[PDB]
Amino acid sequence: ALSDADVQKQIKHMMAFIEQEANEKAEEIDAKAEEEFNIEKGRLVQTQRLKIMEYY
Amino acid sequence: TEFWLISAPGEKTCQQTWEKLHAATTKNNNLAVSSKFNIPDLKVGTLDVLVGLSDELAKLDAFVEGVVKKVAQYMADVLEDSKDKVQENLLASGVDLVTYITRFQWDMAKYPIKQSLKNISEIIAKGVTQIDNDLKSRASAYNNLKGNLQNLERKNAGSLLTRSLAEIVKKDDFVLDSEYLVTLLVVVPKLNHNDWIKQYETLAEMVVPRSSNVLSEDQDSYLCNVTLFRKAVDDFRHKARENKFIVRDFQYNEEEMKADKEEMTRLSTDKKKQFGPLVRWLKVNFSEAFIAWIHIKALRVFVESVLRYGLPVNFQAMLLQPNKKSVKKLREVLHELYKHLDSSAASQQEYYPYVYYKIDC
Amino acid sequence: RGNVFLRQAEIENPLEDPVTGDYVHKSVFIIFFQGDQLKNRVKKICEGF
């Protein structure tokens, strides 16, 4: 039940919800970026450390 | 008890006091009991998944409604200090039911809003389901106990023809260490008790004479017996059944009758001892369950309000208790007071211009 | 519960229904929504009517 402009107002609801989903995506993407550099760091650090110790 | 809950867009900050006692948006001219609901604030989470979330939440709400009504029905089927008719004043966690719906308390510790609202709904489902399974087990076990009592009383129910003679006769009433004889307990009614005491000699042969000694006399038929040869049991029964001499071969046993009676007394005392705590467990199960139910009802109302009103979490609701037979006048007045909220599209049927769900007995 | 604009148009000279034969006036009042659940149940309903 919306006038010719309240339809657009609640469309700005739905678009701000797409924005909230994009912000949740940004938060989870950054958090998984944090997790991923940690994981890849652990992996490659272990590989390099192992190679150095075997050579030693 | 019937109770109403209405939510609104909340376009003005004066609605903080209008939730309590507005005069212009009063109900029944400041006569209906109105108090602002203890409104929390929760995250949005989703909207595309939210419609189906609210639908399945309504299905689960009907499910838990059935669960709590089933708990109340069972506690009434206990039929002692808790019934649908008498002693029905069962307090909501030690506080009166009306008093707790009017003073509902909302907590974050049990159910963090930071989690998904689906997470909370499924945790509620898990808890209520464990309660329900424990309730089915409790029903089976304790009603089996009550049925054991009832069936042991069924063994204590009936005339002496079907009721044991543990405390009526003695071990010596028959011939212990019989040579070739059997003290057949041919119970004869009172219409014919005076006849066997003379006919016993002729009713069979190869028997013990002077076997006219009666044992006991009962309202339906007089207990009595007669001693006779093992093969002659057949002949005496066939001759005596025609003169109204009912045959009932009773066996005496002190040990087994005593054991059965001791089992009966054990079951009675243990049943009281299990029945007290049974009421306690039923009370706490029903207790935690309705508090979860009022919480989940408030959650569904919140979800519907967020669906309808707008991106802000600015919304304003309140309980409502109409006076009887004036709630149609409220239907009209609140239609007027809430139609200007929409002012366009929303026949009505169930899609009211306001938010509402009904709570009842 | 859908809140998106309305692509409005009208059909004149309503060619008969393909399968029955009814020359009855028609129009379109179309709206788009994002929810997949809506794309299920709304379309189920319209097929129903």
Swiss-Prot record, chain A:
The protein, known as: V-type proton ATPase subunit E 1
Modified residues (N-acetylalanine): 1
Function, as annotated: Subunit of the V1 complex of vacuolar(H+)-ATPase (V-ATPase), a multisubunit enzyme composed of a peripheral complex (V1) that hydrolyzes ATP and a membrane integral complex (V0) that translocates protons. V-ATPase is responsible for acidifying and maintaining the pH of intracellular compartments and in some cell types, is targeted to the plasma membrane, where it is responsible for acidifying the extracellular environment.
Subunit: V-ATPase is a heteromultimeric enzyme made up of two complexes: the ATP-hydrolytic V1 complex and the proton translocation V0 complex. The V1 complex consists of three catalytic AB heterodimers that form a heterohexamer, three peripheral stalks each consisting of EG heterodimers, one central rotor including subunits D and F, and the regulatory subunits C and H. The proton translocation complex V0 consists of the proton transport subunit a, a ring of proteolipid subunits c9c'', rotary subunit d, subunits e and f, and the accessory subunits ATP6AP1/Ac45 and ATP6AP2/PRR.
Cellular compartment(s): Apical cell membrane; Cytoplasmic vesicle, Secretory vesicle, Synaptic vesicle membrane; Cytoplasmic vesicle, Clathrin-coated vesicle membrane
Modified residues (Phosphotyrosine): 55
Tissue: Expressed within the midpiece of sperm tail (at protein level). Kidney; localizes to early distal nephron, encompassing thick ascending limbs and distal convoluted tubules (at protein level).
Annotated family: Belongs to the V-ATPase E subunit family.
Positions of transmembrane segments: none
Extent of the signal sequence: none
Curated annotation (Swiss-Prot), chain B:
Task of the protein: Subunit of the V1 complex of vacuolar(H+)-ATPase (V-ATPase), a multisubunit enzyme composed of a peripheral complex (V1) that hydrolyzes ATP and a membrane integral complex (V0) that translocates protons. V-ATPase is responsible for acidifying and maintaining the pH of intracellular compartments and in some cell types, is targeted to the plasma membrane, where it is responsible for acidifying the extracellular environment. Subunit C is necessary for the assembly of the catalytic sector of the enzyme and is likely to have a specific function in its catalytic activity.
GO molecular function: proton-transporting ATPase activity, rotational mechanism
Single Gene Ontology BP annotation: synaptic vesicle lumen acidification
UniProt record similarity statement: Belongs to the V-ATPase C subunit family.
Alphabetized Pfam families for the sequence: V-ATPase_C
Membrane topology: Peripheral membrane protein
Modified residues (N-acetylthreonine): 1
Residue intervals passing through the bilayer: none
Protein name in UniProt: V-type proton ATPase subunit C 1
From Swiss-Prot, chain C:
Disruption phenotype: Embryonic lethal. Knockout embryos die at 5 to 6 dpc, before gastrulation.
Tissue: Predominantly expressed in neurons in the cortex and in the dentate gyrus, CA1 and CA3 regions of the hippocampus (at protein level). Expressed at lower levels in astrocytes, oligodendrocytes and microglia (at protein level). In the cerebellum, present in Purkinje and granule cells (at protein level).
Localization: Cytoplasmic vesicle, Clathrin-coated vesicle membrane; Cytoplasmic vesicle, Secretory vesicle, Synaptic vesicle membrane; Melanosome
Family: Belongs to the V-ATPase 116 kDa subunit family.
Complex formation: V-ATPase is a heteromultimeric enzyme made up of two complexes: the ATP-hydrolytic V1 complex and the proton translocation V0 complex. The V1 complex consists of three catalytic AB heterodimers that form a heterohexamer, three peripheral stalks each consisting of EG heterodimers, one central rotor including subunits D and F, and the regulatory subunits C and H. The proton translocation complex V0 consists of the proton transport subunit a, a ring of proteolipid subunits c9c'', rotary subunit d, subunits e and f, and the accessory subunits ATP6AP1/Ac45 and ATP6AP2/PRR. Interacts with SPAAR.
Protein name: V-type proton ATPase 116 kDa subunit a 1
Organism: Mus musculus (Mouse)
Recorded name of the encoding gene: Atp6v0a1
Shown part of the complete sequence: 199 to 247 of 839
